[PDB]
Amino acid sequence: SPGVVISDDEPGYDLDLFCIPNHYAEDLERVFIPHGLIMDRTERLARDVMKEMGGHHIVALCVLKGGYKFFADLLDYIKALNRNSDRSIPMTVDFIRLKSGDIKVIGGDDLSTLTGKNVLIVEDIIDTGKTMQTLLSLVRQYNPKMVKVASLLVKRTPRSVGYKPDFVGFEIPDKFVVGYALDYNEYFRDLNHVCVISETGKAKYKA
Amino acid sequence: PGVVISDDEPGYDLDLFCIPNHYAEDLERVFIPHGLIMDRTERLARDVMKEMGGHHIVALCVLKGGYKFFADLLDYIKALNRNSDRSIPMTVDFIRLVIGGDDLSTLTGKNVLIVEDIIDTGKTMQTLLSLVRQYNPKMVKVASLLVKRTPRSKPDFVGFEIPDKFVVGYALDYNEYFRDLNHVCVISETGKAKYKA
Amino acid sequence: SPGVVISDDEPGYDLDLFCIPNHYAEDLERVFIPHGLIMDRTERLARDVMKEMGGHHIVALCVLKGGYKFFADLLDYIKALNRNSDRSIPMTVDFIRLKIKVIGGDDLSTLTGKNVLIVEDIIDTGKTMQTLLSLVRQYNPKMVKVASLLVKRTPRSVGYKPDFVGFEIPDKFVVGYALDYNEYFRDLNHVCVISETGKAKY
Amino acid sequence: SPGVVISDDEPGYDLDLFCIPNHYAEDLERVFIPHGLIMDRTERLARDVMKEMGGHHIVALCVLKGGYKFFADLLDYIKALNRNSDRSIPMTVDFIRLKVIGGDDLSTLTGKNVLIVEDIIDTGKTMQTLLSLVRQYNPKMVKVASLLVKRTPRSVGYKPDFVGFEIPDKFVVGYALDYNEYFRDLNHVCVISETGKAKYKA
Numbered sequence A: 001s002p003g004v005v006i007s008d009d010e011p012g013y014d015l016d017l018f019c020i021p022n023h024y025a026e027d028l029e030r031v032f033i034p035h036g037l038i039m040d041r042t043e044r045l046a047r048d049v050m051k052e053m054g055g056h057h058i059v060a061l062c063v064l065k066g067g068y069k070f071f072a073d074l075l076d077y078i079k080a081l082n083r084n085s086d087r088s089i090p091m092t093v094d095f096i097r098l099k100s101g102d103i104k105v106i107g108g109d110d111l112s113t114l115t116g117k118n119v120l121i122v123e124d125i126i127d128t129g130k131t132m133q134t135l136l137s138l139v140r141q142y143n144p145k146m147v148k149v150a151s152l153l154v155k156r157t158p159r160s161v162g163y164k165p166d167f168v169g170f171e172i173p174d175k176f177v178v179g180y181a182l183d184y185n186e187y188f189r190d191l192n193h194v195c196v197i198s199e200t201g202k203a204k205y206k207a
Numbered sequence B: 001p002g003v004v005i006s007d008d009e010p011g012y013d014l015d016l017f018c019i020p021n022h023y024a025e026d027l028e029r030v031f032i033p034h035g036l037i038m039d040r041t042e043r044l045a046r047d048v049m050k051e052m053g054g055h056h057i058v059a060l061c062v063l064k065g066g067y068k069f070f071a072d073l074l075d076y077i078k079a080l081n082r083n084s085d086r087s088i089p090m091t092v093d094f095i096r097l098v099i100g101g102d103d104l105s106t107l108t109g110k111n112v113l114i115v116e117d118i119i120d121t122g123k124t125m126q127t128l129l130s131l132v133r134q135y136n137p138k139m140v141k142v143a144s145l146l147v148k149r150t151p152r153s154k155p156d157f158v159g160f161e162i163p164d165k166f167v168v169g170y171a172l173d174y175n176e177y178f179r180d181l182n183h184v185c186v187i188s189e190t191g192k193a194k195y196k197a
Numbered sequence C: 001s002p003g004v005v006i007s008d009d010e011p012g013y014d015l016d017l018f019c020i021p022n023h024y025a026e027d028l029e030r031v032f033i034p035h036g037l038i039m040d041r042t043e044r045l046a047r048d049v050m051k052e053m054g055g056h057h058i059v060a061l062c063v064l065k066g067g068y069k070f071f072a073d074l075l076d077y078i079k080a081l082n083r084n085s086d087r088s089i090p091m092t093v094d095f096i097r098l099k100i101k102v103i104g105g106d107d108l109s110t111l112t113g114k115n116v117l118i119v120e121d122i123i124d125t126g127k128t129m130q131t132l133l134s135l136v137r138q139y140n141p142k143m144v145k146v147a148s149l150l151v152k153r154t155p156r157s158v159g160y161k162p163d164f165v166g167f168e169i170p171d172k173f174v175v176g177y178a179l180d181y182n183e184y185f186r187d188l189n190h191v192c193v194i195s196e197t198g199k200a201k202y
Numbered sequence D: 001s002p003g004v005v006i007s008d009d010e011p012g013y014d015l016d017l018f019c020i021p022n023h024y025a026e027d028l029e030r031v032f033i034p035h036g037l038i039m040d041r042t043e044r045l046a047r048d049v050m051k052e053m054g055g056h057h058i059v060a061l062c063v064l065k066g067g068y069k070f071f072a073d074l075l076d077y078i079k080a081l082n083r084n085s086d087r088s089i090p091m092t093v094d095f096i097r098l099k100v101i102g103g104d105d106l107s108t109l110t111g112k113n114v115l116i117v118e119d120i121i122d123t124g125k126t127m128q129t130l131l132s133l134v135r136q137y138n139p140k141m142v143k144v145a146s147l148l149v150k151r152t153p154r155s156v157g158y159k160p161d162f163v164g165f166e167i168p169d170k171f172v173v174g175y176a177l178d179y180n181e182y183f184r185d186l187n188h189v190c191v192i193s194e195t196g197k198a199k200y201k202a
């Protein structure tokens, strides 16, 4: 599934109709994906993941920083299924961050711990697909039973990387979005909605 | 005016959300996702407290269809109230069209919030305002999850303004069915026929 | 399934460790059952209900006013089960108030042939629910079950036991989570023991 | 405040009263702190944090791994406060694992209100070490929030600024707290059975 298709001409929502941190009011243009919509989609995704990856021990990899909200919420919905259903399997977690002869993968346990396990990579957004590709390579060379990619967002943008994510929250236009742990120079992570920055905000927090 | 939903709103694919399977063939699209309703209701809760938070609030639930909006709106208002330096009492009552119009005498001198699921003709809102005002409250306000763009009809708090199409879910029914649905949805052909009177 | 048994010597919780409306502070003794504990218990109760009643159309009957919160949350947990399971059953809802005479509600004949779930806030003597069942039984439901958030241990009990129980409590006067004292404290999200200095005010 | 003080004689709750993942049914002995109770406490703690620290830019620092759930939930409560307030403050987040592994540049802490979030304080060694590091970079302030504080004679004598629960000298798992990486996928804080400990023993 490509996930919830958010069309290129999606207008989003007026900021004044939602609850927002008032110190971001002029830094945002529109609410793009309301927090609650993310929850509803993430509920379904949790079931899709259990459908495909259930039946054997899952190792859930959180891609920091931007993946942490989606990760926490996805796993909570998975946990909700597993304690209210007959079908259930153990799930362990790990956290990696890519470096701010290529990208260093900060942290993470011994790579042998993924061997023989159903591995779920959880990302915030697929743009160039290079983040996803490096992580797929970094996991595959330790022979898990399977590797799957969950991503909150996928941008409709030209991509050389072939692999398509297995679980997708929303497929969005090529707009620069923030919120729900997605940042602009470390700001907007505390926003619960996904929003499009304004040119004002982009200039205000520019590094 | 609330969150304005267009006439050409395509809604969302059912297969992208969690829905009860027994309605899978009776629904066409998800129209307003549950989470969107929650987000909008969080904002409305803050709006309500800004206007009415100065004195004892009586929240009046309009059964049946208003029960979920009522429960959620109140929970958000309760959340604000227990995290504020200054709080006010809140009490509740329930009416259905007038059933439960017995001992509304404690509406007197209070800030009364009528909570409805949908305003279409406005006849329900009109009827309840007429009744509540006779108890001489300190104020009367109306919160409605949905307002339809229909010639018939104003509410003080509005979740969403929707087209003139038939919606179900989030306690809104079609012949008493579809209330057990967290989303607001558009009913299919088979659905309207299957649950027809 | 008697529910979470709360002992006579349950100390409850200091009010200052939780969030509560500040105007209720002097009127409460302790938090007795935290909101979250109610949610956790209600979650399990939802699944118990579906295992027992999920084979056929459910009519969820809310006993206003005190039963409304438990009703709303219970059904929400039941709804979560229903939309995430391969199998699922229709559910309708109705509302009545007991003043004993029944106020409001659909025609009793709508309950016929259905699995009827009666949702209540508290059972004390049990006379209220016993009378209610005696009326509903006359219209031949496939099944009638009662879910009560609270059940009091008391010799005043006539012997009626509900089918689903949140919490079995001592004979203390509790308020909150839609349970009231003269229409007050319903806006409390926890169940709390009311003060004698609050009992006298309201 | 020392938080919610749980006694050495705390019996916990029977597993059959709550929703439990079936792959841990044999491995767990008892629910110790229900998930909802944690939420209720975390809500109050969110308000305490903002009262103290909500006057300047807060840097929320998560101590991986076991702190991640408490961190995410505490932040969500703080975010809820912040978006429903006339005056709002910016918040940034960072993650670290203890040798301190992979954080932001330590220079980002300077002049900020740093909130360290941990799952449990036991010997206090971990936190005194971390606090020694952070203070060398002259933050405006440094507070510590820990979900649990263990009541043990084995303690350096360190007390965090915000405490969820003070527990007995017992081994607990759940709510991201682990036993050999297991039991993180559990919403409740619980006590493992002897059969569970042997099963997941290194």
Ligand SMILES: Nc1nc(=O)c2ncn(CCN(CCOCCP(=O)(O)O)CCP(=O)(O)O)c2[nH]1
Binding pocket: A066, A098, A099, A100, A125, A126, A127, A128, A129, A130, A131, A132, A175, A176, A177, A178, A182, A183, A184
């Ligand atoms: N907040 C945000 N909003 C966007 O619309 C966006 N598009 C790309 N990116 C960068 C996302 N980025 C993922 C994480 O980048 C942050 C790494 P940092 O520069 O060390 O903070 C690249 C995804 P890709 O490997 O598939 O191209 C965005 N970030």
Ligand SMILES: Nc1nc(=O)c2ncn(CCN(CCOCCP(=O)(O)O)CCP(=O)(O)O)c2[nH]1
Binding pocket: B062, B063, B064, B065, B066, B118, B119, B120, B121, B122, B123, B124, B125, B148, B165, B166, B167, B168, B172, B173, B174
């Ligand atoms: N389920 C549903 N979907 C709709 O799109 C709709 N439009 C009007 N109505 C009738 C709603 N109706 C309110 C509820 O009618 C009684 C049914 P109950 O509230 O489910 O017990 C009249 C509103 P009005 O006095 O402003 O015209 C609709 N119902």
Ligand SMILES: Nc1nc(=O)c2ncn(CCN(CCOCCP(=O)(O)O)CCP(=O)(O)O)c2[nH]1
Binding pocket: C063, C064, C065, C066, C067, C122, C123, C124, C125, C126, C127, C128, C129, C152, C172, C173, C174, C175, C179, C180, C181
């Ligand atoms: N708020 C509250 N706290 C208590 O601790 C309590 N104990 C008994 N009751 C009264 C319960 N109940 C009467 C409920 O009062 C008024 C109905 P409402 O409109 O839901 O508030 C009798 C049940 P029974 O036929 O099994 O004896 C209590 N109410």
Ligand SMILES: Nc1nc(=O)c2ncn(CCN(CCOCCP(=O)(O)O)CCP(=O)(O)O)c2[nH]1
Binding pocket: D063, D064, D065, D066, D067, D098, D119, D120, D121, D122, D123, D124, D125, D126, D127, D150, D170, D171, D172, D173, D177, D178, D179
């Ligand atoms: N799961 C669990 N249950 C316990 O009751 C417990 N007590 C100490 N510990 C180990 C906590 N430990 C830190 C481990 O933090 C959890 C993150 P992890 O290292 O990724 O598992 C030392 C705290 P201290 O320096 O104040 O003594 C426990 N773990």
Ligand SMILES: [Mg+2]
Binding pocket: A123, A124, A125, A126, A127, A131, A132
């Ligand atoms: Mg990525």
Ligand SMILES: [Mg+2]
Binding pocket: A066, A183, A184, A185
């Ligand atoms: Mg970035």
Ligand SMILES: [Mg+2]
Binding pocket: B062, B116, B117, B118, B119, B124, B125
């Ligand atoms: Mg109406």
Ligand SMILES: [Mg+2]
Binding pocket: C063, C066, C067, C120, C121, C122
């Ligand atoms: Mg009752």
Ligand SMILES: [Mg+2]
Binding pocket: D063, D064, D065, D066, D067, D118, D119, D120
């Ligand atoms: Mg730790």
